[PDB]
């Protein structure tokens, strides 16, 4: 070894969590590690809302390195909102640590039912500074600026439920996690980990699509028009008014997503975007895809993409590295 | 006869639509007639979004009665957002007509994929003035102020698939639509059509709950905590990472809602609220009870409630009248 690793455990076969600590007394929390945001938050002992009941809670009084701030702040995600106030304390990811500005959340009611239905405590953003609220330098950037890691990069190797755990690796790239070569794609903006790829599924093509690589999204997210055309004659049932797309798992018509650049070609076959729902009915699957429109046509390459492809998030070189993940360690 | 009636058509026993016209020429449109909002909007001919390409579009240059405004408006709903600009024109509802402020929508992507998947063109709000954007007096209020109708009230007899069509009746109450007594519940606020009822499912009780009677909602919506307690008494199948559940339609343990006031008792059995998904499996249903947290503990009595109960929306007396709907006309 040489790089620091946070072990990742799957949540309900699609998302994944990892643990980190806040305070000089190493108060532990379970996090969604989220390349699609850029703020760290943990629920406070000062939380009053029902969603905090089952959570680990941060107690600033128990940490000598706590530094008061108290600036109020609301953190908004596509899926919900939490609010509280800024604080500063030692954040420990792996056995790397640094003083860090984060949000003590005291109100989680804007993040229900998700928060209560889930077993994470907080979210640890891994995006770029401009995506942050409160102008926070990213953890991995600060760590390299303070010379605590070799490279301002991190790496995701996602867990698979029955097979193996996953790792968030900070500071370096480990060959054990992927097969074949890494291909690098330059960021089109330092905001999300967003790259430009042609997106192809049917005879449907969206050239130069904005593709966000987002560990904190459980699905593949697709422009609504693209999705509608995708599903035309696919024998997929959209349950009226629900983003719930049901198919025979062995539906021969299900296409393969193909995202291409000059550098590389990344595909997502049905086996990666289908989720079994045998308890709903025999041989049934749902498409783990949703339609979502951004100002610019955008795909979120969420967990289903990252489950197939090992990913490198390189701040120094402003790029995402992609390689086929090893099926087994 | 003698009241203004607008025929209503069912969509999969889950929503309903009615037609109205805009401009002095015909220009027909299909609307969600929505007691939970207070604005009228139609997709403009200036809308080039993929959603609008499948819709009947409003051309303001084809109407002499049109008068420009152009003030930018964003309309927000729980289920999405559309944007455009205010216009004014002759809005014809049934055989009645009046000059009226409405929105020409030019962006619909924040309302996808529901907009494209559905066959309605726009939404006609039937709420109170304080709910509107641009302080628009409700159509029915203005119609009674202009002496086109006897009473500032409207009435909903919802269609039931394979049984009968329905009607939105403006100006008066017709006995043909219901059996037994009407019971009037006073509004707790002039905003939504919102009344106070004790809501109970067994020992799960929320006394003096805020209950919004909403024709534009396809589910029964309950506080998330309330849904969680109800789910403890069921063995339904949760859809992976979605707040939706699958059941056999004949699951005898499915809850019957009971809503009680000093004046009346209302019940809603599974036969009314479940969403059938026969195209996924025989006798399969979505639970169609959705957790939704308002600042105040709130139930939305959506279409499922209104399919069972004929409803009278009385501006003059600030009340909702409730009676058992006739099973067939």
């Amino acid at each position: 070894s040489s790089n620091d690793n946070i072990e990742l455990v799957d949540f309900q076969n699609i998302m994944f969590y990892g643990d980190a600590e806040v305070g000089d007394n190493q108060q532990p929390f379970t996090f969604i590690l989220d390349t699609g945001s850029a703020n760290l938050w943990v629920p406070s002992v000062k939380c009053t809302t029902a969603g905090c009941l089952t959570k680990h809670l941060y107690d600033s009084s128990k940490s000598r390195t706590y530094e008061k701030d108290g600036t109020k702040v609301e953190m908004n995600y596509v899926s919900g909102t939490v609010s509280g106030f800024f604080s500063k304390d030692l954040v420990t990811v792996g056995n790397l640590s640094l003083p860090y500005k984060f949000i003590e959340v005291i109100d989680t009611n804007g993040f229900e039912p998700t928060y209560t239905a889930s077993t994470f405590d907080g979210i640890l953003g891994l995006g770029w500074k401009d995506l942050s609220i409160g102008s926070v330098d990213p953890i991995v950037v600060e760590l390299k600026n303070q010379n605590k890691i070799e490279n301002a990069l991190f790496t995701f190797y996602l867990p698979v439920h029955d097979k193996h755990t996953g790792f968030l690796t900070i500071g370096g790239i480990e060959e054990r996690f992927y097969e074949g070569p890494l291909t690098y794609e330059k960021l089109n903006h330092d905001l999300y980990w967003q790259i430009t790829l042609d997106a192809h599924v049917g005879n449907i093509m969206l050239e130069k699509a904005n593709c966000i690589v987002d560990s904190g999204t459980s699905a593949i997210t697709v422009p609504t028009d693209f999705l509608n055309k995708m599903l035309q004659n696919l024998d997929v049932i959209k349950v009226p008014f629900l983003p719930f797309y049901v198919t025979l798992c062995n539906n021969s018509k299900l296409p393969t997503f193909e995202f291409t650049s000059e550098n590389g070609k990344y595909t997502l076959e049905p086996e990666y975007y289908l989720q079994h729902i045998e308890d709903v009915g025999p041989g049934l699957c749902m498409l783990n895809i949703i339609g979502l429109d951004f100002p610019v046509p955008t795909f979120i390459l969420g967990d289903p993409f990252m489950r197939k492809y090992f990913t490198v998030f390189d701040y120094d070189n402003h790029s995402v590295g992609i390689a086929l993940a090893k099926k087994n360690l | 006869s003698s009241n203004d009636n607008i025929e209503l058509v069912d969509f999969q026993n889950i929503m309903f639509y009615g037609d109205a016209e805009v401009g002095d020429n015909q220009q027909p449109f299909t609307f969600i007639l929505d007691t939970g909002s207070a604005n009228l909007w139609v997709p403009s001919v200036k809308c080039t979004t993929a959603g609008c390409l499948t819709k009947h579009l409003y051309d303001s240059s084809k109407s002499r009665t049109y008068e420009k405004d152009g003030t930018k408006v964003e309309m927000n709903y729980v289920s999405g957002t559309v944007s455009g600009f205010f216009s004014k024109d002759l809005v014809t509802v049934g055989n009645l007509s009046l000059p009226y402020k409405f929105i020409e929508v030019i962006d619909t992507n924040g309302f996808e994929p529901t907009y494209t998947a559905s066959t309605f063109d726009g939404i006609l709000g039937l709420g109170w003035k304080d709910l509107s954007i641009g302080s628009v007096d409700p159509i029915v209020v203005e119609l009674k102020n202009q002496n086109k109708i006897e009473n500032a009230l409207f009435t909903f007899y919802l269609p039931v698939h394979d049984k009968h069509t329905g009607f939105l009746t403006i100006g008066g109450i017709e006995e043909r639509f219901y059996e037994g007594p009407l019971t009037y519940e006073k509004l707790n606020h002039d905003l939504y059509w919102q009344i106070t009822l004790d809501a109970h499912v067994g020992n799960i009780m929320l006394e003096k709950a805020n209950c919004i009677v909403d024709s534009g909602t396809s589910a029964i919506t309950v506080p998330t905590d309330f849904l969680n307690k109800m789910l403890q008494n069921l063995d339904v199948i949760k859809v992976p990472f979605l707040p939706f559940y699958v059941t056999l339609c004949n699951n005898s343990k499915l809850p019957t809602f009971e809503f009680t006031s000093e004046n009346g008792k209302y019940t809603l059995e599974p036969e009314y609220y479940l969403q059938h998904i026969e195209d996924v499996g025989p006798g399969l249903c979505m639970l169609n009870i959705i957790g939704l947290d308002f600042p105040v503990p709130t139930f939305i009595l959506g279409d499922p409630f209104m399919r069972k109960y004929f409803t009278v929306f009385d501006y003059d007396n600030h009340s909702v009248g409730i009676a058992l709907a006739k099973k067939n006309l």
Binding site: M15, I32, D34, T35, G36, S37, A38, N39, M75, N76, Y77, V78, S79, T81, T114, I123, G125, G127, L131, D214, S215, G216, T217, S218, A219, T221, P243, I290, L292, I300, G302 | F241, L242
Partner: peptide, 6 residues
């Protein structure tokens, strides 16, 4: 589903 920042 879940989609993580605005």
């Amino acid at each position: 589903x879940v989609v993580x920042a605005x």
